[PDB]
Design a protein around this ligand. Structure first.
Ligand SMILES: Nc1ccc(-c2ncno2)cc1
Ligand SMILES: [Zn+2]
Length: 140
């Protein structure tokens, strides 16, 4: 699990979204495994606006932060999960690293802020759903 809190937005894995996330839906993209819901409390997270390909992600299954190199956001084929069928995911970044289902929502960050959240795992790769292109997260 895990979320990004920026302004009056909550960003979560679409597959881990709650009924309150869906009842307060702002935006969702099944292709990206992202959902944004509205919050009453102001979020203090900063979204990275950059093209960094290095950063640090939290891995709950190891209670550790790992530094990783990651690919630029791409359309990647992702195998079947306990949450999705084997399909293409857009705006996905891969790194060599440890990712289990419960690691989803772990934040990836660079010097500029939040880059994305863990979304995919397996074959010794971790996929992160990019958020840096969602410029609208940083106003009203
Ligand atoms: N009034 C509502 C609110 C949420 C949901 C829902 N969330 C996830 N799946 O269904 C359904 C009805
Ligand atoms: Zn950056």
């Amino acid at each position: 699990s895990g979320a990004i809190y920026v302004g009056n937005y909550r960003v979560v894995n679409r597959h881990l979204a709650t009924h309150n996330d869906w009842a307060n839906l702002v935006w969702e993209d099944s292709s990206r495994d992202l959902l944004v819901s509205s919050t009453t409390a102001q979020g203090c997270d900063t979204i990275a606006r950059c093209d960094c390909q290095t950063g640090v992600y939290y891995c709950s299954s190891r209670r550790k932060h790992y530094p990783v190199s990651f690919s630029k956001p791409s359309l990647i084929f992702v195998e079947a999960s306990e949450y999705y069928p084997a399909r293409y995911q857009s705006h996905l970044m891969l790194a060599v690293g440890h990712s289990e289902p419960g690691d989803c929502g772990g934040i990836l960050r660079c010097q500029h802020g939040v880059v994305g959240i863990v979304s995919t795992g397996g074959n010794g790769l971790v996929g992160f759903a990019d958020v840096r292109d969602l410029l609208w997260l940083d106003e009203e």
